[PDB]
Amino acid sequence: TPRHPLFEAIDQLLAEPLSIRDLVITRALAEIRETVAREKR
Length: 41
Prior knowledge:
This is RecBCD enzyme subunit RecB. Heterotrimer of RecB, RecC and RecD. All subunits contribute to DNA-binding. Interacts with RecA. Belongs to the helicase family. UvrD subfamily. It is built from two helices and no strands. The protein is an all-alpha fold.
């Protein structure tokens, strides 16, 4: 019964959660440990 690819585009949009959280967590793990090591050095 779904014929148009608009439903498939909506399902592709709702397949993964739209989050900026992973990039901020990766930048935090790259920055905070380096800042702690720089301060202790």
